[PDB]
Amino acid sequence: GQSPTMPQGFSQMTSFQSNKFQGEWFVLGLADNTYKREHRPLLHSFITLFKLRDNSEFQVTNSMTRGKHCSTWSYTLIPTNKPGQFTRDNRGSGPGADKENIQVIETDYVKFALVLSLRQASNQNITRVSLLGRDWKITHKTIDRFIALTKTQNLTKNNLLFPDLTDWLLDPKVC
């Protein structure tokens, strides 16, 4: 695996502040080569949190409450030798230990985070891009930054799914 599907209009962060990237992140952008627009995400926008596991491993806890029924899952992102390059540790697995490569191309804790992900599922690798925000009131200026990723990752406009977010009072429910 020496073909890194990463943006050519951006540059990986030479200094990745792990202790600064941690916290809550709303998903304002979701693009995936194996995604379906009519079978789009179970929600409009999920809340994925990043906890400092050991030194830079991110415990990605995705909170997706569908109605009154919530589902939360946490994984551990393992940093590589590259600044801002991770992989979902699936060492506690064997048969289906398909891992997922996470790479933060452009994060800014005050506004947003451009995160790239490629899940190697053996049969094929899934290229997925996520546009995370500190808050959901992100603008198209910030959205466009994610669009650039979708372009470089060769993800068609069909793969681009954006949160409707006409109403988000998902607080006094669960999770």
Cβ burial of 94 (10 Å; 0-12, 13-18, 19+) is: exposed
Q: Coil, helix or strand for 157? A: helix
Contact 118, 128 (CB under 8 A): yes
Contact 102, 88 (CB under 8 A): yes
d(CA 28, CA 118): 18
Residue with structure tokens 């069909």? 158
Total of domains in the chain: 1
d(CA 9, CA 146): 11
Both tokens of residue 23? 């916290």
Sign of CA dihedral 47, 103, 142, 111: positive
Pick from 54, 108, 110, 112: nearest CA to 79:
54
Q: Give the Cα-Cα-Cα angle 105, 106, 112 (nearest 5 degrees).
A: 135
| Experimental approach taken | NMR
Domain span at residue 152 reads 1-175
Q: What is the 3-state secondary structure (H, E, C) of 1-57?
A: CCCCCCCCCCCCCCCCCHHHHCEEEEEEEEEECCCCCCCCCCCCCCEEEEEECCCCC
CATH number, domain of 45, equals 2.40.128.20
d(CA 89, CA 77): 6
Contact 64, 43 (CB under 8 A): yes
